[PDB]
């Protein structure tokens, strides 16, 4: 019935925009064919729609955001239930739309999203590989469109007047390239050089102008925090990573999120993490900072506010460094080798942080 | 200063043939820039040369084979030592040249080969992905040419008359695509569907017209066969796999090769494995067949000769099936689920094989 429910796109526009030659400078257009289904797969689609947009700035007007708005207005017209949404989108999401879809997925337990992309947008760019990793960890299922999916979206969203789908040359080769690229950038771990040069806890002299953040999640069963291998991650910063962890898909009740950040939070990061832990009673937050970040301003009140709201704040020592080497770094079997005076420096940093967080005088 | 030793190629030819846009139908030339060094990086090159060929049949005339012949004649003119060979080749090797380079590397303890490829030849084709895996397990180091390598072989092998190397557009994007592809096809494991449809041991009715073969190697230390995770593998067949395992690239003395083949060897495979196990006393061979292959001919005497020459020949039961599910299959965490009557069928097949191999009557 999808044909009834959509107003189809021209065969030429489909062939033009879903051609999956990986590099395609000239396509300023995104097309997003979406279908909405119930929990069980035998059921027919409740609705479907085609969205269009441009790749260039003002992302509010990107088809992903248009879908989010349309879907928000659509769910209010139907009894509340669990939905499975499938996308056939000609370009992979941008950084901002990845963030927005990830927030939406992490805060909604009743929505499942599968995204089939024809081409990866900016697969060479570390920000976008991170964007796809964020989307995947929020719970979206990222895939490359293969022959079957082009056939399906020809049949369902294109005015293929009885016409069968006829592939262009090199469709499977482009799929091979794109699916290898997506698989690797999804399974990517931190580089050893950037780990040891960003988590090094000696006084700043060089570099380190970015924040690096590893995180693990555990949940509570029988008063013992059992780990959840499936939702570890690491992020690079120049809002709030806790808005991207789906605290609902992890087996229920309560959670503890352990955080290893190369720099201690600046003021607004502390404010946002405090607001989150205050609006989400079921989550405990543990922070481990390699270094204290002095933003010349309100960082101290930020850390104190974060501490008063239940977060535990400490500095990384040997075991946290080794843990993040083993877990989040592409170590290649090589073991963690600490820099000189790591323990010394971390004890001094612990002293400054304790002075910072100290409330009552002795 | 390789330039002394080579006659450089034209800049036009270099830009034309080493352009690394992944798909390039129109280049049927291969160019192979080779440099030979001793075993340390500080040393200068002893020699270097450029080879050319065509991609299309008669592979004896492919630049890989030309290098093998030239190198064979070259080593006989120099005091024997350990060599490190580096290749800058515009296309990755074909199946046959992958086989021959792999055999050469596996038989030779004094040669180290690193192959930097600009483009992957037939990356979409399972035979060629297998070819690259064969090359890698023989000990060759496969890599994609990046900006640095194009710069290096511009400087060393091209008549860039003082001119520096100026990249074409999309060089790094193509590198990202190609190295994601190479990494994926290198780390590839067997598909679950093809595993259980090829190693299923109930009587043939459908398919199974190809042979699938997993293998692991152990070596002997302290009268206990210690495993060697790094030299496992699996191959698909329509010379002899033991000719591709480098029995010399690990703790010496002696080895045991355990082989799990979906079909028992046909006659000529048995004769070739017998010749290998006879010409290499330091290697023990264990065969596990899922099914007996009756080629209408001399398969029985083949198995019997293989047994006389020291190989141990058995049929797979639950433990071998489960082992290869765990080790060589992309199981995805999913556990091995045996088919009905697996054990029965394996006992009957073991009985037939025992009748086959039986020498003396009782
Ligand atoms: Zn966007
Ligand atoms: Zn060849």
Numbering used by the authors:
A (entry chain B), B (entry chain A): 4 to 142, 147 to 245, 260 to 383
What does the paper say about this structure?
APOBEC3s (A3s) are an APOBEC subfamily in mammals that restrict viruses, including retroviruses, endogenous retroelements, Hepatitis B virus, and Epstein-Barr virus. The double-domain A3G, A3F, A3D, and single-domain A3H (haplotypes II, V, and VII) are active in restricting HIV-1 through deaminase-dependent and independent modes, with A3G being most potent among them. For the double-domain A3s, the deaminase activity resides only on CD2, but the catalytically inactive CD1 is important for regulating nucleic acid binding, processivity, oligomerization, packaging into HIV virion, and effective anti-HIV activity. In order to understand the structural basis of domain organization and molecular regulation of the complex biological functions of A3G, we determined the double-domain structure of rA3G.
The E/Q construct was crystallized in different pH and salt conditions but consistently showed the same structure and dimerization via CD1-CD1 interactions, primarily through direct packing of several residues on h6 (K180, L184, A187), loop 1 (I26) and loop 7 (F126, W127) from both subunits. While the FKL structure shows a canonical fold of its CD2 domain, the E/Q structure shows significant alteration in CD2 conformation, with major changes on helix 2 (h2), loop 3, loop 4, and the Zn-active center. The long h2 of the CD2 in the FKL structure has become a short 310 helix (h2′) in the E/Q structure, resulting in a disordered 14-residue stretch spanning parts of loop 3 and h2 (residues A246 to E259). The shift to a short 310 h2 and extended random coil structure is necessary to avoid clashing in this tight packing conformation. However, this also disrupts the conformation of the CD2 Zn-active center within the regions of h2 and loop 3 that become disordered, resulting in no Zn-coordination. When aligning the FKL and E/Q structures via their CD1 domain, the CD2 domain of the E/Q structure shows a rotation of ~29° compared with the CD2 of FKL structure, causing the E/Q CD2 domain to shift ~15 Å downward and ~8 Å toward CD1, and resulting in a much closer packing interaction with CD1. In the E/Q structure, the two domains interact mainly through h3, h4, and h6 of CD1 with h2′, β2, loop 4 and loop 10 of CD2. Additionally, E/Q* carrying individual mutations F126Y, K180S/L184S, or CD2Δloop3 (as in FKL structure) are all active, even though the activity of the FKL* construct (with E259A reverted back to E259) with the combined mutations is less than E/Q* and WT. These results suggest that even though the crystallized E/Q structure, lacking Zn in the CD2 domain, represents a catalytically inactive A3G structural state, reverting the catalytic residue back to E259 can fully restore its deaminase activity comparable to WT. Full-length rA3G dimerizes through a hydrophobic CD1-CD1 protein interface and dimerization generates an area with intensified positive electrostatic potentials (PEP).
